Design a protein around this ligand. Structure first.
Ligand SMILES: [Mg+2]
Ligand SMILES: [Mg+2]
Ligand SMILES: [Mg+2]
Ligand SMILES: [Mg+2]
Ligand SMILES: [Mg+2]
Ligand SMILES: [Mg+2]
Ligand SMILES: [Mg+2]
Ligand SMILES: [Mg+2]
Ligand SMILES: [Mg+2]
Ligand SMILES: [Mg+2]
Ligand SMILES: [Zn+2]
Lengths: 79, 98, 67, 157, 48, 138, 154, 41
RNA sequence: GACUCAACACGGGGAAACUCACUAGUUUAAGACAUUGGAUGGUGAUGCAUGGCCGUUUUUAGUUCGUGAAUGAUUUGUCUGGUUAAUUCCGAUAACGAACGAGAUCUUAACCUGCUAAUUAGCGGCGAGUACACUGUACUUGCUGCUUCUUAGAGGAACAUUGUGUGUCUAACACAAGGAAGUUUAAGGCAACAACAGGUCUGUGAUGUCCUUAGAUGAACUAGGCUGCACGCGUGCUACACUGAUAUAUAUAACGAGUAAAAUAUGCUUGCAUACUUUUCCUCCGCCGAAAGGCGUAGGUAAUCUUUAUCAAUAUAUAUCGUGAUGGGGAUAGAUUAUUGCAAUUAUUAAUCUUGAACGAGGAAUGCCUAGUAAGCAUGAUUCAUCAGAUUGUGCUGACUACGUCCCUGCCCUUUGUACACA
């Protein structure tokens, strides 16, 4: 889609902060993440971005993506 | 009471333990009845490729369902069930008059 | 239908130590074996007993060439 | 409501997944476990759900990654195994390894039973693929544990 | 996007996302090679 | 009074309940007049013929058969009868008579008392049957 | 033809103590005599089941079928149409592809059942499952069997 | 070839052999005489 | 992709789309991070870069060490012989003694405890009847000691035991009795050492390098093709009839396997939104339908229901054929009625009518097989939205012939020869 609303992004970030970790499911056309109804692709993209900066650390298992938050990431999330 | 499990000996042990518990007092316990072991068989073809004289291999996950009856109150049965136990034997208690 | 060294070895070991207990009677021999040695199988145990019996038979009528 | 057969298979699958996850996570650990810092792991599992051979293998892989003389490392591992009271061991390392072409290298110490249900019982086996310079090195470790008695022995008193 | 709900390309292996050779009995949904490796952990022992 | 034994050929367990009565002899709910094919009828009647029809005027018999095909079922029935009558004799009638009957049965053939232990061997891959492999052209 | 020296007495009471085919034939004959059951419309140019690829060639096959059905009903507690169909199945040669088992044309069977119920021989039981025999019908059947036995003896 | 006809110690085969006939006709003949394999005298 | 065994119904590969790698084209960013660097994806290239896994050598009996002995590679052990399914033993001996492999172990199937247990299995117990016998038998509703059958846990049982032969009267074999069983009882599973430049990067986010990266060899969509056909070689199915087809009737298995889309109502312009609940798989049963199938409902997340004291066909019994390409045979074709699916033409499959081809037992060659086996007969499951002629299990009908041999073929061994070692 390539929209990425800002509010949605913020919500996602908040969720991540609350958790500390995000299990993504590396699926293209799956609509929603289990808890928060966000287009999953967007979420995936965001997580990728985070990984790129090393704000989040990833350990890929089968199907799922299993993202764990780094201390820098946590600091950033303070906002 | 239905005891579903994968491991035979363990299941048997559990059954024995419950029998022992019952024999304490107050329990008209019917003996352990082991049910027809409905074996999950998968016949997979060995070899990722198509090379070699296509050997199959019959796997068998053989589930042991076990069954046991009682005429009792819930709390007592719960207590009886508490033999500690572990992740391996799956227990289910039915507290029905019928 | 022949016996491996493990069976044979076991037989040899018995009759060295427990010749006293044994007599030409199969069941008795088997019992003795059970009492003494640590055979995990049934069939294997039976086989061992049989070979012991055979050994015993062979003695009394002569030297075995062992024990 | 889900049937018993279906349930069992599902459980098995879950177990497998858990194992894989652990493997992915714990490159720095003597991993065997599977019974349920760690907070994150717990969270992950919740999200999802709603002496030993493996450890030795992991260690070997780590060593390889670090960059040792290989043979020496293997020897060390063997020694360690011996110390830990193993009746027998076996390590294989096949792959690229120094040369381009081929080269599988065995490393046995004590005796290693291969055939029978005893093998299935009385050996712990483990397989890791250590990624390296220009490909992968292929660990397989095989340990024969202390027996609860072997079928071959007939111990007369 | 075109109907991806009922066909070989609809679903996949749980493990490696391969559309070919999926053990679809008991809702296992693992392509058979992968299953062969993880048959120990799932609790599938070869007896006979 | 009443005695329950089985026969066994392949899969096909014929359970013979042998009781005190007038001498009818039946299968599930049907007389041994039927069985099914006229040719094989003799394999069921044979033990009776050996022992004598007068000896079974004291003994009613019902037989419950389950599993197997046709011939196998018949064999099972026969086996049940053989075991059954003899078993009855061993308990509620004399021993000498029982022995005599056993001897008679032995003289006729095995299979009446002792069972046929054969059973369908597992099919093996690379073929259709137990041994029968497929085909190589080179 | 059937009779022989046997080593027991036969309690010729119910239909289970009668030889089947002969009994069926007798019942068919009786039906014909009565004119108790019809031969609808399509009966005279239908095929009894997928596998038959050919008409019956018996003229009064319907009657025979009915008789068979009666017997079946007597045998079992509660018996449907599907069950009946299964019972009257045969091998369908698919020419070149190997044979499969072939479920019978159930419509005719259903019609027969309906006819029987109209006449008062079978009974759709509200408890349990599909259509068993009605007691009067059963009695009649038993009587017929007895008659047959008597005839055979004679 | 042997095109047997229809219009004009007992067994059907024998009958066929003797008068050169279809075996349905033989069967019919047998039936008449009387009045899935066969034997008659 | 794979090419002798060890490619050729194989890649679980029965592809209408998806699968899809291909062809004709069309979109898209799933271009992270500091238009540039820089990754990310690949059913792209390379199995002769590799991992793991699998195959074969090989299910045969083989491999190795310690010390000793015999410039070196090495040999011996690990063998003239007998024996064994077996470097299995015995016996001889510059060896003695080990270890892996074999054997044992594991899993079934084989027969017992007339001990352990009794549902979701039965047997009786017994009420209630409906039919008929004699002075009990067949069949259903209602209620609740035994464990033979039904399930499945622990035990037992065969060890060549006793008998008699042949054998260095060694290891062992043959016969007889007993016995459920006497070819480790039958069947598998497991699988040493060392390889093959065997296969697989088209199973993988196991994975190197090289390529490609927006006019992508990434992903997504629309068709089309893998099924195209003078022909050669595979694996099968169906046949060539009368021990049979045809059509009625009768008989009787075992292993099994079974749970985002639709319905109805409200609100507005066939569409959306809102509310609410059965259906998504096995089908009982009741109706419609020649048939296929349909509609309605019922049980089943399963020893309960499908259904299993019977889901099958060969069987068998009675009729029609009558040796005539014949009613053997059902190819090829023509035209409908359905079902699956967004979509059925290059016909998914199914049914109904009709079409009536080759084939009268198969040449050169070559495959499989020794007892519940061959063959015949079906059938469950795997693929599956739909579709077995495949595979894989399971049963049912139940032969012939050995009971050995090295003649061929292939492996293995000792000796021998070699200029071969890519053997
Ligand atoms: Mg071994
Ligand atoms: Mg298709
Ligand atoms: Mg396509
Ligand atoms: Mg290779
Ligand atoms: Mg040597
Ligand atoms: Mg072995
Ligand atoms: Mg193709
Ligand atoms: Mg196939
Ligand atoms: Mg050959
Ligand atoms: Mg040279
Ligand atoms: Zn996979």
């Amino acid at each position: 889609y390539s929209y990425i609303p800002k509010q949605n992004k913020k919500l996602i970030y908040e969720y991540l902060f609350k958790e500390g970790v995000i299990v993504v499911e590396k699926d293209a056309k799956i609509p929603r993440h289990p808890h928060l109804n966000v287009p999953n692709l967007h979420i995936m993209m965001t997580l990728k971005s985070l990984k790129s900066r090393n704000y989040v650390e990833e350990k890929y298992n089968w199907k799922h993506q299993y993202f764990i938050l780094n201390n820098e990431g946590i600091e950033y999330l303070r906002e | 009471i239905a005891l579903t499990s994968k491991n035979l000996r363990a299941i048997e042990k559990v059954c024995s333990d419950i029998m022992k518990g019952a024999k304490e007092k107050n329990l008209n316990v019917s003996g352990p009845v082991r049910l027809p072991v409905k074996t999950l068989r998968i016949t997979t073809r060995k070899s990722p490729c198509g090379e070699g004289t296509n050997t199959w291999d019959r796997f068998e996950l053989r589930i042991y369902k076990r069954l046991i009856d009682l005429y009792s109150q819930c709390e007592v049965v719960t207590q009886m069930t508490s033999i500690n136990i572990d992740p391996v034997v799956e227990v289910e208690v039915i507290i029905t008059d019928s | 239908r022949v016996r491996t060294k493990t069976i044979k070895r076991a037989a040899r070991q018995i009759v060295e130590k427990y010749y006293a207990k044994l007599t030409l009677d199969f069941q008795i021999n088997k019992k003795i074996t059970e009492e003494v040695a640590i055979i995990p199988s049934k069939r294997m145990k039976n086989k061992v007993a049989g070979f012991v019996t055979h050994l015993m038979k062979r003695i009394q009528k002569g030297p075995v060439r062992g024990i | 409501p889900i049937s018993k057969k279906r349930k069992f298979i599902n459980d098995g699958v879950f177990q497998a997944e858990l194992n894989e996850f652990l493997a992915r996570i714990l490159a720095e650990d003597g991993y065997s476990g599977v019974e349920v810092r760690i907070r994150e792991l717990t969270s992950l599992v919740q999200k999802r759900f709603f002496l030993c051979a493996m450890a030795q293998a992991e260690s070997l892989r780590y060593k390889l990654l670090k960059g040792l003389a290989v043979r020496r490392a293997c020897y060390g591992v063997l020694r360690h195994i011996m110390e830990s009271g193993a009746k027998g061991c076996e390590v294989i390392v096949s792959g690229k390894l120094r040369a381009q072409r081929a080269k599988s290298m065995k490393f046995r110490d004590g005796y290693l039973i291969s055939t029978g249900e005893p093998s299935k019982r009385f050996v712990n086996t483990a397989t890791r693929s250590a990624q390296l310079k220009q490909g992968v090195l292929g660990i397989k470790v095989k340990i024969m544990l202390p027996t609860s008695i072997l079928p071959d022995n007939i111990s007369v008193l | 996007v075109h109907p991806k709900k009922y066909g070989q390309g609809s679903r996949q292996c749980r493990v490696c996302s391969n559309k070919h050779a999926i053990i679809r009995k008991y809702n296992i949904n693992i392509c058979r090679q992968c299953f062969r490796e993880r048959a120990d952990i799932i609790g599938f022992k070869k007896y006979r | 009074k009443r005695v329950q034994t089985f026969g066994k050929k392949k899969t096909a367990v014929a359970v013979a309940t042998v009781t005190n009565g007038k001498g009818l002899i039946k299968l599930n709910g049907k007389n041994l007049d039927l069985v099914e094919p006229y040719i094989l009828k003799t394999k069921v009647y044979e033990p009776l013929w050996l022992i004598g029809s007068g000896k079974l005027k004291n003994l009613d018999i019902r037989i419950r058969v389950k599993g197997g095909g046709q011939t196998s079922q018949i064999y099972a029935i026969r086996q049940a009868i053989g075991k059954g009558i003899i078993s009855y004799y061993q308990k509620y009638v004399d021993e000498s008579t029982k022995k005599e009957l056993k001897d008679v049965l032995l003289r006729y053939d095995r299979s009446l008392l002792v069972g046929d232990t054969r059973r369908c061997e597992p099919k093996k891959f690379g073929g259709k049957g137990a041994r029968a492999r497929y085909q190589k052209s080179y | 033809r059937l009779l022989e020296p046997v080593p027991f007495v036969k309690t010729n009471n119910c239909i289970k103590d009668v030889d089947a085919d002969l009994f069926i034939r007798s019942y068919a004959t009786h039906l014909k005599l009565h004119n108790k059951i019809t031969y609808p419309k399509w009966c005279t140019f239908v095929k009894t089941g997928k596998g038959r690829k050919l008409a019956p060639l018996n003229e009064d096959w319907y009657f025979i079928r009915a008789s068979s059905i009666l017997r079946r009903l007597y045998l079992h507690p509660d018996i449907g149409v599907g069950f009946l169909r299964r019972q009257f199945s045969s091998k369908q040669r698919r020419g070149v592809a190997p044979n499969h088992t072939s479920l019978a044309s159930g419509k005719i069977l259903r019609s027969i059942l309906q006819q029987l119920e109209n006449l008062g021989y079978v009974e759709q039981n509200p408890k349990k499952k599909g259509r068993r025999l009605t007691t009067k019908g059963e009695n009649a059947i038993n009587n017929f069997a007895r008659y047959i036995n008597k005839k055979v003896y004679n | 070839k042997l095109n047997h006809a229809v219009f004009i110690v007992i067994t059907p085969s024998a009958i066929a052999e003797k008068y050169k006939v279809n075996l349905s006709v033989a069967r019919a003949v047998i039936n008449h005489l009387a009045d899935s394999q066969k034997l008659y005298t």
